[PDB]
Symmetry: C2
Amino acid sequence: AAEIRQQFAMTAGSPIIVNDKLERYAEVRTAFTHPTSFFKPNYKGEVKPWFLSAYDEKVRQIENGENGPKMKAKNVGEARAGRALEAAGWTLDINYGNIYPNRFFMLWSGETMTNTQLWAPVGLDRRPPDTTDPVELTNYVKFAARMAGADLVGVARLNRNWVYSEAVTIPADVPYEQSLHKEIEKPIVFKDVPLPIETDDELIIPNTCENVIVAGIAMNREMMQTAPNSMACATTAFCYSRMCMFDMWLCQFIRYMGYYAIPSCNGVGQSVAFAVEAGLGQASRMGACITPEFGPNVRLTKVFTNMPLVPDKPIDFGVTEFCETCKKCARECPSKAITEGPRTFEGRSIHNQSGKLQWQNDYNKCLGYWPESGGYCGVCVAVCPFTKNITEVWDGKINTYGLDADHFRDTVSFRKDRV
Amino acid sequence: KEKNAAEIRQQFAMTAGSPIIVNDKLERYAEVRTAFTHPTSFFKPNYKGEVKPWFLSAYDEKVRQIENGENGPKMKAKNVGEARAGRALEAAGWTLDINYGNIYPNRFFMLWSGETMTNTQLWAPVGLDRRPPDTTDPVELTNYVKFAARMAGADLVGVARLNRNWVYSEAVTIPADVPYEQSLHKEIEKPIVFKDVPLPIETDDELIIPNTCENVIVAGIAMNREMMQTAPNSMACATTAFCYSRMCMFDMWLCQFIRYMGYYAIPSCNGVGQSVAFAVEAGLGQASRMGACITPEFGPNVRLTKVFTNMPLVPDKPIDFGVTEFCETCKKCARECPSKAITEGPRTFEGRSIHNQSGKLQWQNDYNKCLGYWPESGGYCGVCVAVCPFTKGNIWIHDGVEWLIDNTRFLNITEVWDGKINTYGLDADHFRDTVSFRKDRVK
Ligand SMILES: Oc1c(Br)cccc1Br
Ligand SMILES: Oc1c(Br)cccc1Br
Ligand code: SF4
Ligand code: SF4
Ligand code: SF4
Ligand code: SF4
């Protein structure tokens, strides 16, 4: 697999084509959060927050012995087990995605963490860096990234175009039990300050925050191929908790090396753009980053840092030309959210960032299918050529973290392929 | 013949019954007696002769090594930056672990109820933790819970009936009103008792496990071979540390699954009871001279955690692949141990010191001597694990009829940082050994 990645390396430079209209995108505009898309009816006709309507459908399916919309389970017990696995997978994730910056798991400084307090006498986070050489730092941090659970890791200079103009967060002293009802919008700004810092008014990223480290966290193929049913939800959920652990582990390593580090999971900025600029894969018709190793069946998280690093090269292995003629995701999408048309610079709705050349999809149509189906769909990921019943999945092949030993050698790494 | 870990486990499976041999002086063991916590062993001199809590003296040695550009005792690093990087990696690995081991029950990550967790609150409208179980068949439950366990990061998983002999008589914990920054100064003992109650509960005086708590699920969390082979130096400390955080994630993930199936679940990591005994009874491996559970897949180079539950399950069979007989003649760990903590003598039922639980046949090691080497070396040693022939990846051969151990196996850090790695430090050359189908999970 290291052969292929070297073979398809592009020359340096962001491969995302932009025009003079591009502006940073306010996070509240996503379909998950925006007032125009947030409320959806449940199966009884009651309008609720979309995830509560989705909950009602999960309950209905368990009672009716179903693993998904009009997909009968082996019995009620199997139906229950799939939703229990899904719910458990989210254990280390806040309110579906860890998006609030500098809250809960996503702290922008390590100072208050229990691990930092226990290690304080050693003073690793107070000691100036002993290594400033970006080549050695790139090798160290990528090794750490693999220890921390990334199946793929890449480095890019930070393109501020993909950092949200304003984040969705909560006030700092609001308890978890009130968080969903007290979400607010808060600017993310870049200033000449020593350290990432949050004021009452602003999330402040230092101008020295040069780089972004992007991690790919592989989902399980057997489970994703049950999309839109419950086991696809379960591999989604478990990987969100893997994302969170990656961010915390890697931020701590970077801090203990003498630099600062900002975790993010689904917050702070647009993961797909970062992942493309860092060479993990290419943008696709469905909108996901398609990787050679996993196709789009891989989750993304990222960490921002002033640690000196060597940027990776973007890769071109023909995804754009293949998506131009394929359209399989668009034809299988249960909500017709994915376009069959050509790429443009103009978003279809508020949910798209205009000003960048991409396939423009209707993400409110996507979200509408989630309460209907009682899950997170994923049919587009499941049918994509690059990616390649529920009783058979439960009785079938599994391995640690859902990884597959038939392909796990493809992500082996030596220094030569780290820097 | 291509290595078949499932065939190996089938070949060496025993008939039912705890393999640990006990006599009449066996009593449950108070957790405060471990070398980490007992006042006789807790204090150790640093390299300047100052007597401190052992981990503070070890800190002093880590700092000295970085300043002198060393990766371990008398082991020069490539440069100061490499020495720094190894300790940064080690420190980061512990991110999801409280005070080296997560031992306080029902505190921090080790909650005995899911009710207050952010995930439970988010999911409350579905009622999964309040709805009665839809599955009570132990066969289906074993398949379900083991699949979840592999999703949750276990490289090995097994089930045993809970043997209360290995549950600590009293736990080490902190009062519920004590904040983290004072925890190390406010540790206390608290009895673990079994009573006729519906759910695990803590009172001001007792940690109460229900009499319905029939089963224990044991997970093996594989460490990285290349890094452990640097024991007693910093990279062995880093694979130890990262696996403690994997243990914590496993416990929380699995307890939440079990609760959402309609049962209760008690996490534990290094607390609550003795992991090696549970692992032996659950068939992960056999006890050894060094004292660890040796597994066919990883030897002793694997961490353990466990979850206690009333979920009906099918116990696994113990395994006997000849470890006792190899340990009888090997003694490599005993010869290489830098503190001479491991005995070269026979097994007995009589503890060597307060740190051993008497009344069970085992090799009796001096664990105060072991702990004494940790401040001296500035780490968690591991030389015994590193030199054990079972830690080697290629011990198994097939003779055309059956699997056997190759007797011939019993006769630097820069290169690790520049060398092979993969996700979670797992090794794709051997990762096929832990593939699992339904037949591997429940018979
Ligand atoms: O990424 C997600 C977010 Br942010 C919210 C709900 C579900 C998913 Br998947
Ligand atoms: O298992 C451990 C405990 Br409990 C404490 C310190 C170091 C280790 Br390793
Ligand atoms: S997740 Fe489902 S509804 Fe959404 S774009 Fe993909 S196929 Fe369509
Ligand atoms: S299904 Fe086809 S068009 Fe859609 S993302 Fe995959 S390759 Fe592209
Ligand atoms: S080194 Fe030898 S005696 Fe020690 S635990 Fe391993 S096999 Fe047994
Ligand atoms: S960890 Fe080190 S000091 Fe302790 S028993 Fe093993 S070899 Fe000896």
